[PDB]
């Protein structure tokens, strides 16, 4: 890792010109864009100046957009492998030889390098012996490309490398073009270079037209990941600090809410949490997330040191003066810690995400269960003032071990507003779930003790044991379902609306309705707690990658201002489910009981989880496409496949049919246009093999007889609808 990474971190403007000519055409190109090599986005607006360009649009796409190639994104463990980010503070110089099948070549050379603060690609196009009437040159290319791998070689000779990569491009008939793009990178300057070993970079490309341009003009849009080397399999010194400073802050300050576990002050305490989560959290990138966090534990820390003065202070205007500002600071810090956590601990991880706060609730519960022995310890030793001291000793002496240990993100800052998240239907029926659930435990915390002492005459360390016991229940049931939300993002869903409603059986069987006719015993109440305890832990982790993946679909910029504004929301949610809860958890109870109040809960519950179950059997449009029809025949024979394709209409879409025998690459096979009068297929299947479309069933059929030994092969299934998408395939023996 030289210097030159240093210029990529941020986004980058970027100038790009080209002048070529084919067959004695002329063409000129003038474009300018915005790149970021940190996630490997790049966005290009290309205009044509002389008039009708010859060449199709996607055929340029390579020669334009892929010399971008110095932002790509490096992983962690590829940075020593990097080169194009070696040579760029001076440039590198790009040849390239582009081979079409059947038809010429061109023959590139540009030049990339920073000019002041922007990036210019300088190229000279030049293509020899293509057909009037062919592909190319008449014009029968589509609109239309997909993504690829590049594979890329040293040379150690030439101080340069060598790479090689092979491109699909579609045609309105249903073929496809096969380039092959043979290509040399040399560093201008005689500095110190990064040779690289052997590696490919992924290449998803999706072209647009603006709709407010009447010149020729095309919006090219890139993502670019690299790949091919293996890992050791752990986490480097950043993700470990961020593990143990994540660990010190929820161990701190569980010690901090435990050992020492009016109603305007519980109303000022959630309510201007709520206001305190939303401006902190919305204003993350302009404070610091470090400066948020360290700021965050010295606050939480002068709580507690400062909590344990007001034995000495008399009561008067001084005690409300300094209750009403410990409670106020204690709201604060809470939610600046919280909302500078998720945002720091979400960004270290991009994709473990419900694991590693599953881990943070599980050190969590580790904070409870260790709270209060050693509290009891030092409080029957010493007294009630001395240990309320050295736990402010403890918050305190961790802020300077703790500024050294965490690391500097830093972002620009953000441009869309909290309305455009909000504004979401997906988002607030979450929100729901969140606020209700917050809700059900703020009406379960008060008013179990007493209904436990009024029924069956038992004191308040069994009812503090079955409230340890529900957390620790939640401490278990978080690590296990973050990791399988993780897992299998598709089963997030139903990881939640499930759990909801897990949770309003629970709200039923807690205290036995009058309705339901069962015998009221205690091991009832016990049982139900630890479920409900893990209905709520099940259903309380995947609600983060959730709204984070809607926003990512939504056209929020990745960064930390979406995980801040997320964290924002969540907080956000939680404290308006704690105000909630108790008061009319409270108001109902002495209205008409526990037992009803508890049914009113679930009621809740019951709604908010039957509109997202409603919501999602509602919505649901995926382009997933699925293979059917493997099977074994002798030569000779015949067979039928299909594949079953939803999230787009068939009819207004291209299909093509692919082949890769074992051991050897994919080779197209079958096309299917739009109108569906036109179909092309290769030589080795042509007349034995039909291409056939039910577009009622959105089904793709494809007919072979007379079944050769050379088709023993997997079978897949192609659409491009910006993005392709692959099918499964099947696995058809010919023996």
């Known amino acids: 890792v030289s210097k030159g990474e240093e210029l990529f971190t941020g986004v980058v403007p970027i100038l790009v010109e080209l002048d070529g000519d084919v067959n004695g055409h002329k063409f000129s190109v003038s474009g300018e864009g915005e790149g970021d090599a940190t996630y490997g986005k790049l966005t290009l607006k290309l205009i044509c100046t002389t008039g009708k360009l010859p060449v199709p649009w996607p055929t340029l796409v390579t020669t334009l957009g892929y010399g971008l190639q110095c932002f790509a994104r490096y992983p962690d463990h590829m940075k020593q492998h990097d080169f194009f980010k070696s040579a760029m503070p001076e440039g590198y110089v790009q040849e390239r030889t582009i081979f079409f099948k059947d038809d010429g070549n061109y023959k590139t050379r540009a030049e990339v390098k920073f000019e002041g603060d922007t990036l210019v690609n300088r190229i000279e196009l030049k293509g020899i012996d293509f057909k009037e009437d062919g592909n190319i040159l008449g014009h029968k290319l589509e609109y239309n490309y997909n993504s690829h791998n590049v594979y890329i070689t040293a040379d150690k000779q030439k101080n340069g490398i060598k790479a090689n990569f092979k491109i699909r491009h579609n045609i309105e008939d249903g073929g496809v073009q096969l380039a092959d793009h043979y290509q040399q990178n040399t560093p201008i300057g005689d500095g110190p270079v990064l040779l690289p070993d052997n590696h490919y970079l992924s290449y998803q490309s999706k072209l647009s037209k603006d709709p407010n341009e009447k010149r020729d003009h095309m919006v090219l849009l890139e993502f670019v990941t690299a790949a091919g080397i293996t890992t050791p399999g752990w986490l480097s010194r950043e993700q470990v600090f961020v593990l143990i400073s994540a660990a010190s802050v929820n161990l701190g300050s569980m010690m901090c809410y435990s050992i020492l576990g009016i109603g305007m002050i519980f109303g000022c305490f959630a309510l201007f949490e709520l206001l305190a989560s939303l401006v902190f959290g919305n204003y993350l990138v302009h404070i610091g997330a470090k400066f948020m966090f360290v700021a965050g534990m010295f606050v939480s820390g002068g709580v507690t040191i400062l909590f344990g003065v007001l034995d000495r202070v008399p009561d008067g205007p001084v005690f409300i003066a300094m209750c009403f500002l410990v409670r106020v600071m204690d709201a604060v810090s809470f939610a600046a810690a919280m909302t500078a956590s998720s945002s720091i601990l979400a960004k270290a991880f991009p994709n473990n995400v419900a694991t590693v706060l599953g881990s943070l609730e599980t050190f969590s519960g580790l904070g409870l269960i260790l709270g209060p022995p050693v509290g009891g310890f030092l409080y029957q030793s010493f007294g009630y003032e001395v240990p309320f001291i050295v736990l402010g000793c403890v918050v305190l002496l961790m802020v300077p071990l703790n500024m050294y240990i965490l690391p500097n993100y830093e972002s620009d800052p953000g441009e869309h507003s909290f309305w455009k998240l909000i504004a979401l239907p997906k988002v607030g029926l979450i929100a729901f779930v969140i606020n209700s659930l917050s809700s059900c435990f703020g009406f379960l915390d008060p008013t179990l003790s007493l209904f436990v002492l009024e029924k069956f005459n038992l004191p308040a360390g069994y009812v503090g044991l079955v409230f340890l016991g529900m957390a620790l229940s939640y401490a278990i049931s978080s690590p296990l379902f973050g990791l399988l939300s993780d897992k299998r993002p598709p089963l997030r869903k139903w990881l939640l609306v499930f759990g909801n409603l897990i949770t309003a059986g629970c709200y039923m069987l807690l205290g036995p309705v009058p309705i339901l006719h069962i015998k009221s015993q205690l091991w009832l109440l016990v049982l139900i707690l630890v479920v409900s305890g893990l209905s709520a832990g099940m259903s309380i982790i995947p609600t983060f990658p959730e709204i984070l993946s809607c926003a990512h679909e939504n056209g929020f910029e990745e960064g930390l201002s979406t995980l801040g504004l997320v964290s924002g929301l969540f907080s956000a949610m939680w404290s308006i489910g704690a105000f909630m809860g108790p008061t009319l958890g409270g108001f109902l109870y002495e209205k008409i009981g526990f037992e009803w109040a508890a049914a009113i809960q679930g009621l809740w519950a019951l709604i908010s989880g039957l509109a997202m179950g409603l919501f999602y059997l509602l919505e649901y449009s995926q382009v997933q496409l699925v293979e059917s029809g493997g099977a074994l025949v002798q030569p000779g024979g015949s067979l039928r496949l299909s594949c079953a394709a939803s999230?787009?209409?068939?009819?207004?879409?291209?299909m093509r049919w692919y082949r890769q025998a074992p051991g050897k690459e994919r080779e197209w096979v079958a096309g299917?246009?739009?109108?569906?009068?036109?179909?092309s297929y290769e030589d080795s299947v042509k007349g034995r093999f039909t291409i056939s479309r039910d577009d009622a069933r959105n089904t793709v059929y494809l007919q072979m007889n007379s079944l050769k030994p050379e088709d023993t092969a997997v079978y897949y299934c192609?659409?491009?609808?910006?993005?392709?998408?692959w099918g499964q395939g099947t696995q058809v023996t010919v023996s």
């Open positions: 299917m246009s739009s109108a569906g009068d036109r179909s």
């Open positions: 999230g787009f209409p068939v009819n207004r879409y291209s």
């Open positions: 192609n659409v491009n609808v910006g993005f392709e998408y």
